[model samples]
Target: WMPAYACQRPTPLTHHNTGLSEALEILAEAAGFEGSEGRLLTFCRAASVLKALPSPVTTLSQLQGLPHFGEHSSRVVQELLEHGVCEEVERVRRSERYQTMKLFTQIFGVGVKTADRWYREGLRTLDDLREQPQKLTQQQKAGLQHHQDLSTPVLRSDVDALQQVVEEAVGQALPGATVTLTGGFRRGKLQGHDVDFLITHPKEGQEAGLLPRVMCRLQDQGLILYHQHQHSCHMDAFERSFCIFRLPQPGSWKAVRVDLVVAPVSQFPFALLGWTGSKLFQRELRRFSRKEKGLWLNSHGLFDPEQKTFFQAASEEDIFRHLGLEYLPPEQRNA
Candidate 1:
């Protein structure tokens, strides 16, 4: 049987079980749309298990006795294996409610709860959302304004160029500051919905207020299209800024979404591992840290409840080692 926790398994960036995982993840998203948290997590777990498999699952028996593939998910897999598709999955894919929820949730700064609220209010399209501007937050308004640009896929080249721009801005503001790419691009994906970056300094206290300085530099250079920054609550708090950048292309500058997170040098490793996520993998890692290791893990750092102290990790490898897990490279951490 597959392990109950994704942290116990090794999932690669590319897998042989894509077909099985896709159908299961669709079910997971549909469950989320319906507000069934338990069902959503169950389907997500099923998908994660399939992603970790070493071989293509050709037979229904291949999934037998697996931890999360219960009757429903197993049946869905069987149907796909025999017919190349699942009926229920197709129905969910084409349903109006699912499509609307997917569209609403895809907007920057709009989460499932907000999307669900809008859906219940019978607000089905972007126009409906615009008609009720009083109900929309500034972030939501910006998201709507740049919906087309944000919806466009960011190419690998775009990410590379954006990295260069960010590096220049960071270097210009703080001479010794560094920028590290995260997210799907860091995991070796060729394209992504947005480019993510982690900014830090070698010294412990030097990273504080790096975001504003960097943002000012980018803004002065006319690179910032739209941005929303959230300040850190305390000295050790994780500070993040979400922005849309005017990416210089061949003939025209395109709007590209970029996420910047600033963490002190002491917490860089934890922040990197947390933000460099396949969401399911990160969730499972945290759960394993708390349940099996008696430690609490987050983007900030790792804490040992019994020891009444924090575990300091100089690198991501140390984090995996502390959790008794083999260090999987970013390319193999797609779970």
Candidate 2:
């Protein structure tokens, strides 16, 4: 639970209190149009609607009044509540590109670049591309390798299993390392597009060396199917290296995407606020920082204008307070 505004410290990061999330399952399937590209696009539209509703969605008309709810989408959502699925949404379920994109993009780290590239290369299907003797990016190769496992939406049960695996690994390879789940999973979600974790140890100097050791442990045990490592800068509230790791689940060859952000214990709060992102919540935080305060901010940390100093937030609450915002929960973070 978090407040909604700085001036109102007790303000909660409340929900729009709408029931559309129930239809999200069918909506996801309906978006299978053009390879869930329609679905992803719908996600943006739906989010726009959700953002609007947090304040104004007292009735269905109010919901309809929100932006991004085109006549088509609104009709679809309205029909969804009555019939369990929208007619047009169901129609998109039968699209070929939707199925194709769903299949090829399931592999880890295969984003717009690879998907578009593969589409233009006449490599229309994963089956066709499989035998092409082509050079796949590490991400592409991993995606191909872990297709089935990665495609499965993560269940809360998986998060528990993942936590156990991660806890055990850290125990062995990065003792005293503090770890947190971020992204959608941390926001009381029942599922996630992928799993994300934030890591740090109270001892600042001890954390930098943690990611490599942890990655090695997972790699040695064949837990991580693929990974990309990077670092956050020093001279900030939080300074730690980070990595995105793909780990294989038991009895499955596909790897599940996981983001691992390592930060100084001093920056855990900032990392938490950053990771609890609704994407737009993060964007707005930046807007407030740069446009309102003449400050620059990132996952690395926030910059302070007046002091010309990198103010380290000991907790996320400190950060929101500093930013003149109340802490917000992930759902409300859609901004």
Candidate 3:
């Protein structure tokens, strides 16, 4: 059994109950893709509980008092305990509805609502959407164009290789700029759907105008396969550039997705914490911060509303400490 509140629990990335947790999360994602919010939360809570366990779940008795394990979730756990796989999860993974919904929802700007509409409309293929009277946005069009490559798992080594070239271009553009690998990579996930990098400078304003220069250098060197640039405002707003990189492989070049975010030195720590996320971890942390601490937290920084001022943090640990939370490293934050 585990705590009911996700914020009260520490879910480390490397856990002993991965088998049970993985199966539950599969159902959670499936429920999410199908727009079953209640069902989705149920599975998510169950998985989160497993993630917080101090020991491996070896028998059905071990799960007897877990807070969110309803009959269905408990059955899934029991099945996994007896066997290597849960049949229901495999069925969902193999089903047309689940597979189609997953594909539709993975696009950059798409959501479960849109994915559900597309599913019921009988749009089974990317080609189907392309031929529709419904016009696609430039972003969605790009997502469709690189569906196969974008959906491919980005290995950890792929991230390191991509980081090298990106760092080179950024240094050439602005010598003081720094690049950080974020997202799942920062959380110790072995692989992810894409790579995310956070870029900044030692000086507060030097990061301005850095993205275009870096993009230009990357483009000139034939590193950028496709890109969409969003300019930054000198105020609190940060600049971001999303790109598909032509990464060199053993025999050929492969398209790898990369996200670059530039923030002022003032906001770098907050931005780093925001971007280095298991989506659930970020959401729960922010929710907990506001509700429990009577403070505000976002990608920008932490603020004490009562004091009418933002708190300065040099690192993620400081931010966690400000919120009165136990500092869980990125590796232990796979909520």
Candidate 4:
């Protein structure tokens, strides 16, 4: 039987129900644009469930008993299966508000709230925003300037070159530091919107202050175009950096977004599982942990509230075992 939570399933990067899942995902994104978090989650879960299915959904009856397929999601799938298109999805795709919101939110540093605000202010095109530069923040200005380059998909070749440069920087900063690629690429994606890296040392506490040193080295090498350093706080206590790297091209360089995070050896497993995400997979996993297992799970550690103790995980498998879930490798976490 298919499980209700995405963490309980193996969702491959390539799936059998691409068409059905893509349709649901569009509705999910549309829900997100409208600020309906609950609706967005529901639709996203439904789409993730479709991605985990072993075979294509050839008939509406196949959706029966499948988890997360509510009335709305089922209707969308039915329309696509029966008529080759869903009216609601098509309508949402063509709406001016949806199109504009999508465009605005695609810009780095711009969230739904900001995009919604811009839409309400009669902003329809990038040119409109370019005219009001004063309203934009530093991050937004850089995002706008690199919008064209950032819009391009990051290839695997790009990831390799960037990783090598990052490794060199990390080596220079701390000889024992190691960098592991995470995110969609780790989940078997050939192309991604951005590259994510998790840095850690085999010895505990050695990873502290690693991000700043690495960033300084990379900046000194002129590989950094823009960077914002964030001190560890909140649930994830890892020093991190969000940066745009000037990747060398044939004749010039292209701007590429890269995320660098440093985790201690103890928390590396949790950090790895959290960072190597399909977004929905992590969300559903946390929901499962809290709602079903009575545990608080985050990038740092998993906590048992009643026990008042943190569970130690040596690897990703340990976390899954603690959650009583069958272990899922990174390649199968594409929910």
Model 4 alpha-carbon drift over 4 Å, by segment: 234-236
**TM per candidate:** 0.96, 0.71, 0.90, 0.96
Q: After superposition, how far is residue 41 of candidate 4 from its true place, in Å?
A: 1.6
By summed lDDT, which 10 consecutive residues of candidate 4 come out lowest? Answer: 231-240
TM-score of 4: 0.96
Higher-lDDT candidate of 3 and 4: 4
lDDT of 1 at 109: 80
Candidate 3 lDDT, 271-323, residue by residue in tens: 98888877777877888888888888888888888999898889988998878
lDDT of 2 by residue, 141-220 (tens): 66666566666788877777777777777778767887788787665678766877777787777876677787788777
Backbone clashes counted, model 4:
0
Per-residue lDDT of 238 in model 2: 38
Q: Candidate 4, residues 1-335: lDDT per residue as tens digits?
A: 89888888899889899998888888889999999988998988898988888988999999999888889999999999899999999999999999999999999889999999999999999999999998798888889999988999999999999999999999988899999999999998999899999999999988878889899999998999899898887224678888899999999998999989888899999999999987888988998999989999999999988999999899999999999999999999999
Give candidate 3 misplaced runs (Cα > 4 Å): 1-9, 82-91, 232-237
Candidate 3 colliding pairs: none
Candidate 2, residue 81: lDDT: 53
Ranking by lDDT: 4, 1, 3, 2
User: Could you tell which candidate, 2 or 3, scores higher by TM-score?
Assistant: 3
lDDT of 1 by residue, 112-133 (tens): 9999999999999999999999
